[PDB]
Amino acid sequence: DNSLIKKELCTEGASVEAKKVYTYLRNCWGRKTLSSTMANVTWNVNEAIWVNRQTGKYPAIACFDYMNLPASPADWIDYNKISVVEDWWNAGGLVAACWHWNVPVTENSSEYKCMISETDFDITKALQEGTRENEIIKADLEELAGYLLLLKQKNIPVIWRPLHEAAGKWFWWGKDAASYKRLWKLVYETFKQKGLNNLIWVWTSETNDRDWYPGDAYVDIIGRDVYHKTSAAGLATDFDALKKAFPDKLIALSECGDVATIDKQLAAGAQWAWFMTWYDYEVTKDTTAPVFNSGQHEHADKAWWNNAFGQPGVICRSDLPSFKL
Ligand SMILES: [Ca+2]
Ligand SMILES: [Cl-]
């Protein structure tokens, strides 16, 4: 059943909690699919709260985004304030994080973006020791490693998914496979130097992009991000292709929106390790606003989520075992 999936994380001496989380996911492979929601933008669990108000159940995994490194610390975003992550973990939920790596729109700008169409930041220069771009990404990694170390010191592991969708060539890190792989290894080695042993590394594949794969030494789980795909058969075809490319690794639907209901996906063979719905900015940015209660959602509405939780294979937060002690 799951004998092909690797038993060990790529990180030597990974934390007890990271190993427990990974081992649980490995045990679920082919049998269960975890539910997950994205934060509203970055640093909250507003979509998890929204899902509970629609269904009575919470998602198993809450994901956060370190996108706003340039502004942190600020009145409105401070990644040193880890209570929102701590509180989720202590309520028994799993913690995930991604990272829209925002860089100056142009040299000396005060605007920060991540799409190639919105920044001229050049990864090839960022990898050359001593350049302006290199100093920028080193300082970002130092700041980010410090924020992640706050979670490590609280014994909170993170299902960590940086540098995603590289081969789509729409983010500044998607210029070319060779420089992309060098950047992934720099992030990994920088974090290793900082002592971050609480991370499970998720590499997001666009399918048929093996030239972009950073390597077994730097990756634990494969992710796929899919929007606007309502053929469950097509979703299963993607799932199968990823399983074939990476037969030793769990495969997750790490982002989705406007996709076939989970019952159809599962019946077609798309047996993802988890699915994470993207956020609807206007609906969940304010949990006190009337729109919070309506049930409509750009990515997965009330009916979609009640369908998902109606399926035997789908895990909610209260289904999870304990990952602490
Ligand atoms: Ca900062
Ligand atoms: Cl629950």
Residue numbers in the entry: 37 to 361
Give sentences from the paper.
To investigate the structural basis for the galactose side-group tolerance of BoMan26B, and the biochemical differences observed with BoMan26A, two crystal structures of BoMan26B were obtained: an apoenzyme structure and a structure containing the saccharide 63-α-d-galactosyl-mannotetraose (G1M4) in the active-site cleft. The two structures are very similar, 297 Cα atoms align with 0.148 Å root mean square deviation (RMSD), using PyMOL. A weak electron density was seen in the −1 and +1 subsites of the apoenzyme structure, but no molecule from expression, purification, or crystallization could be modeled with confidence. A calcium ion was modeled with 0.5 occupancy in the apoenzyme structure coordinated by Ser-108, Leu-105, and Glu-179 and three water molecules with a binding geometry typically seen for calcium. The calcium-binding site is not located in the active-site cleft and thus does not have a glycan-binding role. BoMan26B contains a potential calcium-binding site and was 100% stable over 24 h at 37 °C in the presence of 1 mm calcium, but it lost about 40% activity when it was not included. Trp-112 is situated in loop 2 that is also involved in the calcium-binding site. Thus, the calcium-binding site may play an important role in the correct conformation of the −5 subsite. A surface view of BoMan26A and BoMan26B reveals a more open active-site cleft in BoMan26B, with five subsites on the glycone side, whereas the BoMan26A cleft is narrower and restricted by loops 2 and 8, resulting in only two glycone-binding subsites. The longer and more open active-site cleft in BoMan26B correlates with its preference for longer substrates and production of a range of oligosaccharide products.
Here we report on the galactomannan degradation machinery of the common human gut bacterium Bacteroides ovatus, with a focus on the extracellular, cell attached β-mannanase BoMan26B for which we here solve the crystal structure. As for other GH26 β-mannanases with determined structures, BoMan26B has a (β/α)8-barrel fold with an additional N-terminal α-helix and the two catalytic residues (predicted acid/base Glu-201 and nucleophile Glu-291 (50)) located in a cleft. Extracellular BoMan26B initially cleaves galactomannan into shorter oligosaccharides, which are transported into the periplasm by the SusC-like transporter.
